[PDB]
Design a protein around this motif. Structure first.
Motif, PDB file in Angstrom:
ATOM      1  N   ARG A   1     -13.317  -3.959 -12.059  1.00 47.02           N
ATOM      2  CA  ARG A   1     -13.819  -4.475 -11.317  1.00 47.02           C
ATOM      3  C   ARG A   1     -14.590  -6.083 -11.656  1.00 47.02           C
ATOM      4  O   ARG A   1     -13.607  -7.038 -11.283  1.00 47.02           O
ATOM      5  N   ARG A   2     -15.682  -5.442 -12.077  1.00 48.63           N
ATOM      6  CA  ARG A   2     -16.223  -7.303 -12.205  1.00 48.63           C
ATOM      7  C   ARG A   2     -16.235  -7.721 -13.677  1.00 48.63           C
ATOM      8  O   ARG A   2     -14.893  -7.547 -14.524  1.00 48.63           O
ATOM      9  N   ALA A   3     -15.602  -8.818 -13.547  1.00 47.39           N
ATOM     10  CA  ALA A   3     -15.657  -9.997 -15.350  1.00 47.39           C
ATOM     11  C   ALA A   3     -16.711 -10.271 -15.510  1.00 47.39           C
ATOM     12  O   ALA A   3     -17.829 -11.179 -15.476  1.00 47.39           O
ATOM     13  N   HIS A   4     -16.424 -10.692 -17.156  1.00 47.27           N
ATOM     14  CA  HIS A   4     -17.574 -11.590 -17.428  1.00 47.27           C
ATOM     15  C   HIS A   4     -17.115 -12.941 -16.991  1.00 47.27           C
ATOM     16  O   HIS A   4     -16.446 -13.259 -16.559  1.00 47.27           O
ATOM     17  N   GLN A   5     -18.588 -14.051 -16.823  1.00 47.48           N
ATOM     18  CA  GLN A   5     -18.357 -15.158 -16.308  1.00 47.48           C
ATOM     19  C   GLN A   5     -19.688 -16.430 -16.448  1.00 47.48           C
ATOM     20  O   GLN A   5     -20.002 -14.981 -17.148  1.00 47.48           O
TER      21      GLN A   5
END
Length: 19
Positions: free
Chosen positions: A15-19
């Motif tokens: 779901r989440r991702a590096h940003q």
RNA sequence: GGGAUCUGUCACCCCAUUGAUCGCCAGUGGCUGAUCUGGCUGGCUAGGCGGGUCCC
């Protein structure tokens, strides 16, 4: 081995991702 | 070279198939291979890479 595929569960766990 | 912020991509764990669709074999059953997926004050003072900006 010979197969180049990967195992993946029916329910997605990404779901989440590096940003 | 270092720090901060933003964006894109990838991984794992818990909970939503008495939600759905496609394909092969099969009117017994089996396979996630794909997509969709709410809770991130659920875990990035947990991780990697590229680009832009700012500061030194």
């Amino acid at each position: 081995g010979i197969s180049y595929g990967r195992q993946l569960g029916k329910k997605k766990h990404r779901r989440r991702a590096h940003q």
